[PDB]
Amino acid sequence: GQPVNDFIDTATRHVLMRQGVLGIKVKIMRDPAKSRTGPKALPDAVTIIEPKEEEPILAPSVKDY
Amino acid sequence: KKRKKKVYTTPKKIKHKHKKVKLAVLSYYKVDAEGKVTKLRRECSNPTCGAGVFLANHKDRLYCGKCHSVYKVNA
RNA sequence: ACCCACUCGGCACCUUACGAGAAAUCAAAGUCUUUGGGUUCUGGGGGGAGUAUGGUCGCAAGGCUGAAACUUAAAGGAAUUGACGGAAGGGCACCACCAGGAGUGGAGCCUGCGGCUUAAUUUGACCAACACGGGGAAACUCACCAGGUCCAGACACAAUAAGGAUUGACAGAUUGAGAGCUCUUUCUUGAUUUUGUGGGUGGUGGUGCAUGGCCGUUCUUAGUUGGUGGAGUGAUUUGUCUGCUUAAUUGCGAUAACGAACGAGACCUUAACCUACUAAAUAGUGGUGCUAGCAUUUGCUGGUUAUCCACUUCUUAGAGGGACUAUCGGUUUCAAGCCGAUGGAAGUUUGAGGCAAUAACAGGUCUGUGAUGCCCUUAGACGUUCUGGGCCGCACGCGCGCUACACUGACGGAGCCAGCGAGUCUAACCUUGGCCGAGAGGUCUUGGUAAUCUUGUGAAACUCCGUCGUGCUGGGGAUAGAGCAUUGUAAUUAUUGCUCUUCAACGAGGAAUUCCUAGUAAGCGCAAGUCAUCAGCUUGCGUUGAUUACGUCCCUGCCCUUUGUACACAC
Ligand SMILES: [Mg+2]
Ligand SMILES: [Mg+2]
Ligand SMILES: [Mg+2]
Ligand SMILES: [Mg+2]
Ligand SMILES: [Mg+2]
Ligand SMILES: [Mg+2]
Ligand SMILES: [Mg+2]
Ligand SMILES: [Mg+2]
Ligand SMILES: [Mg+2]
Ligand SMILES: [Mg+2]
Ligand SMILES: [Mg+2]
Ligand SMILES: [Mg+2]
Ligand SMILES: [Mg+2]
C-alpha cells in the first residue's frame, strides 16, 4: 500500500568480502505519530473521542445571569 | 565457451628501433683553421621550423627534420 | 411373562487412566531399576532360509525336526510434518470447461528458434524458451571471422643511458590503405621512456551450480507467524475451528485458548457525477458592442482582451462534495449476509490498475553496471582500436504474426469525425505557408523550448453516389525487371519511399490448439519506444462495436478439511 511509501524507508548496500559480495537490505518503519508532514497515522487506525459523560438534570430550572 | 590457440600464418615482425650511431658532432659543424664556422645545412622557409632546423639530405632530396618539408640540394 | 433391589458365573461395552507403554493404545499390555506368586513355550540386526543335509511321518502333495558357507548397515515399529492418490467432502478459475465469438494450425510473406551450411554464420533462454534479451545488427552496436595497428603495461627495483633511455617522420618499396606498421639513405625531440624482475590494469573471457541486485515462477490463490497458556517424552500441535457467509484466515460465530502481527481489506493513481466554489488571449461562449463578407423583415461566417465588454455550460486544475450496497420488499442458525425493485452520474470490491506476506526454485541474468569471489588471459593480448566480412547465409521442422481467399467486396469521386503523445539554440527537432515536381521528394520562409505552433495531428474503419459483375475476375499482390528520390562516409547481399511492368499460391484451411463475459471480443487506424534510415514488433490511445453465459467440476488445474501411503530427489 501507500503507507509503504509514506512510512517505510529502505536502503540496499553491497559489501565486498574476500569470498564474494554480501547484500545488506535495511528496512525501517518509523512511527507515524511523529513528524509533522503527510499523514500522521496509518489508514484505518480509527480513534474515538471520549464522550465526556454528563448526568441529566430533572427540573427545568430557568437560569438568568 | 572453449577457445582455441591462435595459429599464425605469417612470421612475427619486430618493432623498429632507433638507429645506434656515434655521429652527433661529426657531420653537424666544421671548424676552419682560424675558427670561422658557417652552418652548411639549409634553412626552412616556414618560420616555425627553427634557426637550427638542420635540413637533412637524401640521394635526390633534402629532408627538413621537424616541418617535414622536401627540397633539392641542386637548386 | 415384565418391574425394582441384590448376588454368582459369562460374552462384551462406556469414561478416565491414578498405573503401564516407543507410541498406537491397554482394566490389563497395571500391581516392573521401589526390578522375585507358580509354571510351559518361543526370540537375540537384516538376508541366505524354513533353504541344504540327516532323520521321521505321508500313497502323493507335503508335514515335523532343521544348519552352514557366504553376504550386508541397516532392515524394522509407532508416531509428526509435507507431498501425492484413477480417495472422500466442501469451494474456485475463460492462463479450465459449458453456450459461443474471433481465430491459429492450411497459403504467400515478416520475424524468432532448431538443423544444415560457413572463415564466421557470436551468444543466453527449451506452462515459467522461441516480434524475449526492450535483440527492428550496412559502419558503430559486436561479443564471431580474415588481417593491420596501439598500450591507454600505474607504481617499486635493477640494468642501458651525453646523444642515450627514447620517440616522431616527406618520398620509394610495401599495405586495402596518405598505418614510418616493417624497411631504403638520415634528420627531429630529449631522464617524458626502453629492457628485465615483481606487481598492476583491462577482458560482452569461464563459472548464474561460488555470489549481490533485479526480475520471473511456485501463486491470483488466501495464505503466514511469534508471546503467554493448554496437549504430547518428542518431532509437533492448539491458537489458525463444525456450520453459515465473503473475492478474501471477509465476517457471524463456536471455542483450551487469550490477546496480537503480516498478508486481504484499508491505502494510492487513474476513469466516470458536480450547472456547488475559485478563475482563466496559453480554453472557450455570448453580446456581433466594433467595424465587416455573403444571401435576405435574420441566417451563416471574418478579424473579436492592446478594437471591447461580460461569463465559466462545455475545456483545464486546486480545494471539496458525492456511494455507505441508501430506501423498500423478500430470505437466512433470521447474525454475518444474499436476491429483486425504486432512486441515483455511479449499486461484480462502481470499472481498471499500483502496491502486495511467509517459505522457496541450484528458475534467468557474470552480455546493464567502475556489483563481484575464484579460475584463465594480459604485448604476435581473450585488452583497445581500424579495414572488410558475418550475425540476413538455405534440401528442412517449429512458435509469435502480417496480408488474403472477395459483391457484409475491390476500385473512383465526394462526405468527413478522435484520443493518448512528442518536439530544436551545448544545433538542426516538430514543421505550417508559398513555389516546383506524377510521385516519392526539392526549395524559400514562418511558428513552436510548446493548453500558445506543428494540430481541429480534417487517422482509418466508416458513410453516400458511381465503375465492376461471381470469371483466381477489376479478389490476392508474392516473385521479378526497368527507372526516379531520400538517410547515411558507405545502400552490392537489393535501408526505405515512388512510377511502370510481371501477376505465384490462396476459393476459408486435418489432427490439433489459443484468447475472451460489456464499451468487453472483434474490426480500424493513431501516437510513443527502439530511430540518421528502417514496423509486418511492443507500450498506450481512441473510432466502430456483437453473439453467447451469469453456470459447472466433465477436462485442465487452484484452495481448505478428512483419509491412505512402503513417497521426503517427495508419483
Ligand atoms: Mg492492497
Ligand atoms: Mg457368554
Ligand atoms: Mg537372526
Ligand atoms: Mg486458420
Ligand atoms: Mg561488424
Ligand atoms: Mg539461479
Ligand atoms: Mg508452548
Ligand atoms: Mg569492426
Ligand atoms: Mg537475429
Ligand atoms: Mg483534442
Ligand atoms: Mg536496419
Ligand atoms: Mg515508430
Ligand atoms: Mg522487438
Of the candidates B33, B43, B37, the residue with the CA atom closest to the CA atom of residue B66 = B43
| Resolution at which this structure was determined, Å | 2.2
Cβ atoms B55, B43 nearer than 8 A = yes
For this PDB entry, the determination method is: cryo-EM
DSSP assignments along B2-62, one per residue? --PPP--SS---PPP-------SSTTT----SSS-----S---SSSTT-TT------SS-E
Measured CA to C1', the nucleotide nearest B3 is C382
Calpha distance B66→B55 (Å, rounded) = 9
Distance in Å, CA A10 to ligand 10 centroid:
42
**CA of A4: how far to CAs of B16, B22, B38, B52, in Å?**
68, 81, 90, 78
Q: Please give the single-letter amino acid code of residue A27.
A: K
Region class of A44: left (phi > 0), else alpha (psi between -120 and 50), else beta: left
Q: What are phi and psi of B67, to 5 degrees?
A: -85, -10
